[PDB]
Amino acid sequence: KTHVQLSLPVLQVRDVLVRGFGDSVEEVLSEARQHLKDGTCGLVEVEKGVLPQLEQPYVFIKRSDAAPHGHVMVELVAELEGIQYGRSGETLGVLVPHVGEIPVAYRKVLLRK
């Protein structure tokens, strides 16, 4: 399928144990997609002081359209040293590995895969 319904656990930035997906734009997009498929991906909501506590390159989920079955359609955009790789809508948050942190909420997304 071109899209997959996922329910992403929303993590507090200070709980996150693995603060990014890797060392290059291509690697972090690759690893983010793998962890989304494997159910091992968390979401951190972006606010003042969040991104400097995570590791670049960043992987965002961004709204791709204006929401089937409650799932916002999203796609992945990476960021490294202020340059973004991809073009999309509003940020829903920054993706990180999930290694068993307790979430505060879930974000229902339809991921363009």
Swiss-Prot record:
Question: Reported effect of changing K37R?
Answer: In strain: Omicron/XBB.1.5, Omicron/EG.5.1
Signal sequence, start to end: none
Q: Which domain of life is it from?
A: Viruses
UniProt-annotated stretches for the region Disordered: 1-113
Q: Where in the cell is it found?
A: Host cytoplasm
Domain CoV Nsp1 globular stretches: 2-113
Role description: Inhibits host translation by associating with the open head conformation of the 40S subunit. The C-terminus binds to and obstructs ribosomal mRNA entry tunnel. Thereby inhibits antiviral response triggered by innate immunity or interferons. The nsp1-40S ribosome complex further induces an endonucleolytic cleavage near the 5'UTR of host mRNAs, targeting them for degradation. This inhibits the integrated stress response (ISR) in the infected cell by preventing EIF2S1/eIF2-alpha phosphorylation upstream of stress granule formation and depletes host G3BP1.
The protein, known as: Host translation inhibitor nsp1
Specify the species.
Answer: Severe acute respiratory syndrome coronavirus 2
Stretch of the intact protein here: 11 to 125 of 7096
